[PDB]
Design a protein around this ligand. Structure first.
Ligand SMILES: OC[C@H]1O[C@@H](O)[C@H](O)[C@@H](O)[C@@H]1O
Ligand SMILES: OC[C@H]1O[C@@H](O)[C@H](O)[C@@H](O)[C@@H]1O
Ligand SMILES: [Cl-]
Ligand SMILES: [Cl-]
Ligand SMILES: [Cl-]
Ligand SMILES: [Cl-]
Ligand SMILES: [Cl-]
Ligand SMILES: [Cl-]
Ligand SMILES: [Cl-]
Ligand SMILES: [Cl-]
Lengths: 303, 303
């Protein structure tokens, strides 16, 4: 709704940008493992036909397994290339969507994959890392769990990259719509980012938007449920932005809008996006997977 | 709201794409002047510091003055370069915002300029043409007034350019939000386009969004008031897309969203867009100029 007591200048100076945003994280793996205090950490890589990059991402994280990281899983979304064998050969456990939750038939999309990994993992903390990253740095996982292990009351950590010496959906769609609908969340540098960590308590109890909606849906549901102070962001390093075609970005934008409208009380038409020059159509989903807590008691493998 | 009776495939095949969309207009200036039937035509060029291009745009239209076109005006928005003298030297009449409507102090933005030109022009038909166009073709005005003069019941004509052998705000923001909020309007190729014509009756009776909202606001208000059949589009030729910086586009996108939310019953926060890396803020307007018919009777120069 209408928030005339908040201005763009207020946001640019917001205290949250100081206490909850680490622009130069300096934690070490030893002291983070020290602060685990009995909490376990699961790392999850969603993967659909990522044979060229998945091993390289797994390798940057594998030295943490058995120490800081307790579980390192690639959640395979029906890949037909060599994603699975290469992930296993890089030291990761690979789980299909069917094995993660066999009672429910798989739907397409990233959100489905991450939702199912809630049922396949056991960590009190779950880190998500895209498996298409070309230049993954081995400090990703430690910088994402920093605030969850040390700071009090953080439940979601979004990892951002500073741009070198620009994601267009993020800059033109996600952040401006957040300015209009959830203005405090414009403090989050990269709301659509694929690198983030969250507590199991939180993630088990919110729905999962399907497809490309999942990241922004999780951000907005966390904010609505727990306030801005429950969210943090950390600099993961200097990744430069990878190229995608505008037609991909247009359909992705449509789903980002539907997922945001869904959480912000805005009635979405449900009509997919047509593109011309001729016609090219795409589809949008308006139904989330319900909170995974909903399925408790009724699974062969317990939660 | 929710429109489950309409699909993206329905839109890609919509009859409107046939009867109201001219992909190869063939009208001639002589037969269009023939069909004027006593209606006059005003052409308006909004202009803020456009000294390099304004004359070139005026010249492509000046041969029509006294024939098809009855008025050729550049509405100067406070330019400090040589926009005014160069427009006059190219054969156009130049009118400041103050001279167009002296009772009301000028607000910044394109929408303000076009709204004020309603009070400075007299044509039953008004054509708007951006004054920053690098390669303007002299068939622009004739192709825009085609449907208004010949076809029945058209009241708004949007001119589109086919891309050579892509506006990012149009493709990622305006068209996807229209898919969610006014799905029929995704049939319009370039909703944000600066080249369009409309009947005086229509334009006098709708508000004018300020700033970068004006084009999409006029499209949506026309659609709501008169239905899709009152709108047409025509191919103006092969213009390639000109470059703008993403930071411009981000603020422009924010205002497009606010203008669309305003017309579609969506409560906009009114908070401007902040951008980081640090902070850079911009502002958004939530107040339109009311329909110009509102001011009738109360102006020194009559309407
Ligand atoms: O699903 C949303 C999309 O956001 C993008 O910025 C990232 O590349 C991915 O996390 C994903 O493809
Ligand atoms: O105001 C909206 C903007 O739309 C853009 O596509 C055009 O270049 C102009 O008509 C304007 O700058
Ligand atoms: Cl099912
Ligand atoms: Cl599937
Ligand atoms: Cl992006
Ligand atoms: Cl919680
Ligand atoms: Cl005033
Ligand atoms: Cl001004
Ligand atoms: Cl554009
Ligand atoms: Cl009318």
């Amino acid at each position: 709704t209408l928030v005339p007591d908040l201005t763009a200048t207020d946001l640019a100076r917001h205290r949250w940008l100081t206490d909850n945003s680490w622009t130069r994280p300096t934690w070490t793996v030893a002291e983070l493992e020290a602060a685990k205090a009995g909490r376990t950490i699961s790392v999850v890589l969603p993967a659909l036909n990522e044979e060229e990059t998945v091993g390289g991402v797994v390798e940057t994280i594998r030295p943490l397994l058995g120490g800081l990281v307790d579980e390192l899983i690639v959640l395979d979304s029906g890949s037909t290339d060599d994603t699975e064998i290469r992930a296993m050969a890089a030291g990761a456990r690979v789980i299909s969507r069917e094995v993660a939750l066999p009672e429910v038939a798989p739907q397409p999309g990233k959100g489905e994959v991450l939702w199912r990994s809630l049922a396949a993992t056991t960590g009190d903390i779950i880190v998500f890392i895209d498996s298409d990253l070309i230049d993954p740095d081995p400090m990703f996982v430690p910088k994402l769990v920093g605030p969850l292990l040390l700071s009090e009351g953080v439940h979601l950590v979004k990892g951002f990259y500073r741009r070198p010496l620009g994601g267009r959906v993020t800059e033109l769609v996600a952040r401006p719509l957040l300015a209009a609908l959830r203005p405090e969340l414009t403090c989050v540098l990269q709301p659509l980012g694929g690198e983030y960590a969250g507590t199991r308590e939180l993630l088990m109890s919110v729905p999962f938007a399907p497809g490309y909606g999942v990241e922004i849906g999780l951000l907005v549901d966390t904010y609505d449920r727990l306030g801005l102070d429950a969210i943090a962001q950390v600099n993961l390093g200097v990744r430069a932005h990878r190229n995608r075609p505008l037609t991909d970005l247009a359909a992705m934008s449509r789903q980002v809008i539907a997922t945001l409208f869904s959480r912000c009380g805005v009635p979405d038409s449900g009509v997919g996006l047509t593109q011309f020059f001729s016609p090219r159509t795409s589809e949008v989903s308006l139904v989330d997977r319900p909170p995974m807590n909903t399925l408790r008691g009724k699974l062969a493998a317990a939660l």
